[PDB]
Design a binder for this molecule. Structure first.
Ligand SMILES: NC(=O)[C@H]1CCCN(C(=O)[C@H](c2ccccc2)n2cccn2)C1
Ligand SMILES: [Zn+2]
Length: 139
Protein backbone atom coordinates (compact mmCIF):
# COMPACT_ATOMS: atom_id res chain seq x y z
CA UNK A 1 0.00 0.00 0.00
CA UNK A 2 0.99 3.66 -0.43
CA UNK A 3 0.16 6.96 -2.08
CA UNK A 4 1.74 10.22 -3.30
CA UNK A 5 0.11 13.40 -1.88
CA UNK A 6 0.85 16.46 -4.05
CA UNK A 7 -1.19 19.67 -3.89
CA UNK A 8 -4.87 18.68 -3.83
CA UNK A 9 -4.20 15.28 -5.46
CA UNK A 10 -3.68 11.72 -4.18
CA UNK A 11 -1.85 9.32 -6.58
CA UNK A 12 -2.37 5.57 -5.97
CA UNK A 13 -2.06 2.24 -7.83
CA UNK A 14 -5.35 1.96 -9.78
CA UNK A 15 -5.80 -1.68 -8.58
CA UNK A 16 -5.65 -0.53 -4.91
CA UNK A 17 -7.91 2.59 -5.27
CA UNK A 18 -10.65 2.83 -2.61
CA UNK A 19 -14.39 3.69 -2.98
CA UNK A 20 -13.43 7.25 -1.87
CA UNK A 21 -10.74 7.50 -4.57
CA UNK A 22 -13.31 6.55 -7.25
CA UNK A 23 -15.89 9.00 -5.81
CA UNK A 24 -13.33 11.84 -6.06
CA UNK A 25 -11.80 10.66 -9.40
CA UNK A 26 -9.64 13.14 -11.38
CA UNK A 27 -7.96 10.74 -13.86
CA UNK A 28 -7.21 7.03 -14.23
CA UNK A 29 -5.39 4.84 -16.74
CA UNK A 30 -5.67 1.02 -16.57
CA UNK A 31 -2.69 0.68 -18.99
CA UNK A 32 -0.46 2.51 -16.46
CA UNK A 33 -2.01 1.06 -13.22
CA UNK A 34 -2.52 4.67 -12.01
CA UNK A 35 -5.42 6.58 -10.46
CA UNK A 36 -5.47 10.17 -9.15
CA UNK A 37 -8.21 11.48 -6.83
CA UNK A 38 -8.87 14.92 -5.27
CA UNK A 39 -8.13 15.78 -1.61
CA UNK A 40 -9.26 18.56 0.75
CA UNK A 41 -5.86 18.88 2.52
CA UNK A 42 -2.61 20.11 0.90
CA UNK A 43 -0.14 17.30 0.11
CA UNK A 44 3.31 16.58 1.65
CA UNK A 45 5.17 15.49 -1.55
CA UNK A 46 6.85 17.19 -4.59
CA UNK A 47 7.36 15.52 -8.09
CA UNK A 48 10.65 15.09 -9.93
CA UNK A 49 10.82 16.59 -13.48
CA UNK A 50 13.95 14.89 -14.77
CA UNK A 51 15.52 11.92 -16.61
CA UNK A 52 17.21 10.22 -13.57
CA UNK A 53 17.64 6.48 -13.88
CA UNK A 54 18.89 5.93 -10.28
CA UNK A 55 17.04 6.50 -7.04
CA UNK A 56 15.85 4.97 -3.78
CA UNK A 57 12.56 3.18 -3.13
CA UNK A 58 10.67 2.11 -0.02
CA UNK A 59 10.10 -1.67 0.31
CA UNK A 60 7.28 -2.30 2.83
CA UNK A 61 8.01 -6.08 3.00
CA UNK A 62 11.47 -5.29 4.41
CA UNK A 63 10.57 -1.97 6.23
CA UNK A 64 13.62 -0.55 4.41
CA UNK A 65 14.73 1.67 1.58
CA UNK A 66 16.94 0.32 -1.23
CA UNK A 67 18.96 2.11 -3.96
CA UNK A 68 18.14 1.05 -7.58
CA UNK A 69 19.16 1.57 -11.22
CA UNK A 70 15.94 1.46 -13.34
CA UNK A 71 15.00 1.47 -17.02
CA UNK A 72 13.38 4.45 -18.79
CA UNK A 73 9.53 4.39 -18.84
CA UNK A 74 8.40 1.84 -21.41
CA UNK A 75 5.71 -0.64 -22.60
CA UNK A 76 6.29 -3.95 -20.70
CA UNK A 77 4.30 -7.19 -20.76
CA UNK A 78 2.65 -7.96 -17.38
CA UNK A 79 1.15 -11.41 -16.78
CA UNK A 80 -2.56 -11.85 -15.90
CA UNK A 81 -3.31 -11.37 -12.20
CA UNK A 82 -6.49 -11.14 -10.07
CA UNK A 83 -6.57 -7.41 -10.95
CA UNK A 84 -5.90 -7.29 -14.70
CA UNK A 85 -5.91 -9.50 -17.77
CA UNK A 86 -2.52 -10.27 -19.42
CA UNK A 87 -1.52 -6.95 -21.12
CA UNK A 88 1.23 -4.40 -21.87
CA UNK A 89 1.59 -1.85 -19.08
CA UNK A 90 2.88 1.54 -20.30
CA UNK A 91 5.20 4.10 -18.53
CA UNK A 92 6.71 1.19 -16.48
CA UNK A 93 10.36 1.16 -15.27
CA UNK A 94 12.09 -2.04 -14.12
CA UNK A 95 14.93 -2.49 -11.64
CA UNK A 96 16.64 -5.36 -9.81
CA UNK A 97 15.34 -5.37 -6.25
CA UNK A 98 12.96 -7.02 -3.79
CA UNK A 99 9.21 -6.63 -4.28
CA UNK A 100 6.47 -9.03 -3.14
CA UNK A 101 2.63 -8.79 -2.94
CA UNK A 102 1.81 -5.88 -0.62
CA UNK A 103 4.77 -3.70 -1.81
CA UNK A 104 2.73 -1.77 -4.44
CA UNK A 105 2.48 1.90 -3.53
CA UNK A 106 6.04 2.25 -2.17
CA UNK A 107 7.57 5.52 -3.40
CA UNK A 108 10.66 5.75 -5.66
CA UNK A 109 12.53 9.11 -5.31
CA UNK A 110 15.60 10.66 -6.87
CA UNK A 111 17.44 13.85 -5.75
CA UNK A 112 14.68 15.92 -7.56
CA UNK A 113 11.63 14.43 -5.88
CA UNK A 114 9.10 11.65 -6.37
CA UNK A 115 9.64 9.60 -9.54
CA UNK A 116 6.91 6.95 -9.23
CA UNK A 117 5.36 4.10 -7.22
CA UNK A 118 5.89 0.33 -7.02
CA UNK A 119 3.44 -1.36 -9.40
CA UNK A 120 4.90 -4.86 -10.20
CA UNK A 121 7.38 -7.37 -8.74
CA UNK A 122 8.63 -10.93 -8.42
CA UNK A 123 11.68 -12.90 -9.56
CA UNK A 124 14.06 -10.42 -7.90
CA UNK A 125 12.63 -7.55 -10.01
CA UNK A 126 10.65 -4.42 -9.04
CA UNK A 127 8.55 -2.34 -11.45
CA UNK A 128 7.60 1.32 -10.90
CA UNK A 129 4.78 3.28 -12.53
CA UNK A 130 6.33 6.62 -13.60
CA UNK A 131 4.60 9.89 -12.68
CA UNK A 132 7.17 12.46 -13.96
CA UNK A 133 5.23 13.10 -17.18
CA UNK A 134 2.02 14.16 -15.31
CA UNK A 135 2.86 17.88 -15.33
CA UNK A 136 -0.65 18.87 -14.22
CA UNK A 137 -0.05 17.35 -10.73
CA UNK A 138 1.97 20.58 -10.00
CA UNK A 139 -0.82 23.06 -10.75
N1 LIG B 1 0.67 -3.59 -12.29
C1 LIG B 1 0.05 -4.77 -12.26
O1 LIG B 1 -0.50 -5.28 -13.24
C2 LIG B 1 0.12 -5.51 -10.93
C3 LIG B 1 -1.28 -5.76 -10.36
C4 LIG B 1 -1.22 -6.60 -9.09
C5 LIG B 1 -0.50 -7.90 -9.37
N2 LIG B 1 0.83 -7.63 -9.94
C6 LIG B 1 1.99 -7.96 -9.34
O2 LIG B 1 3.07 -7.74 -9.86
C7 LIG B 1 1.92 -8.61 -7.95
C8 LIG B 1 3.08 -8.20 -7.09
C9 LIG B 1 3.13 -6.93 -6.55
C10 LIG B 1 4.29 -6.46 -5.98
C11 LIG B 1 5.40 -7.24 -5.95
C12 LIG B 1 5.36 -8.52 -6.44
C13 LIG B 1 4.20 -9.00 -7.01
N3 LIG B 1 1.75 -10.07 -8.03
C14 LIG B 1 2.34 -10.95 -8.87
C15 LIG B 1 1.83 -12.18 -8.57
C16 LIG B 1 0.92 -11.96 -7.54
N4 LIG B 1 0.86 -10.68 -7.20
C17 LIG B 1 0.81 -6.85 -11.18
ZN1 LIG C 1 15.83 13.16 -10.80
Amino acid sequence: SGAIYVGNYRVVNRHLATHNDWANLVWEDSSRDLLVSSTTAQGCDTIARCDCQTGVYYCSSRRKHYPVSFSKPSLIFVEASEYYPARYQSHLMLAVGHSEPGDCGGILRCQHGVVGIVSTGGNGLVGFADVRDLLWLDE
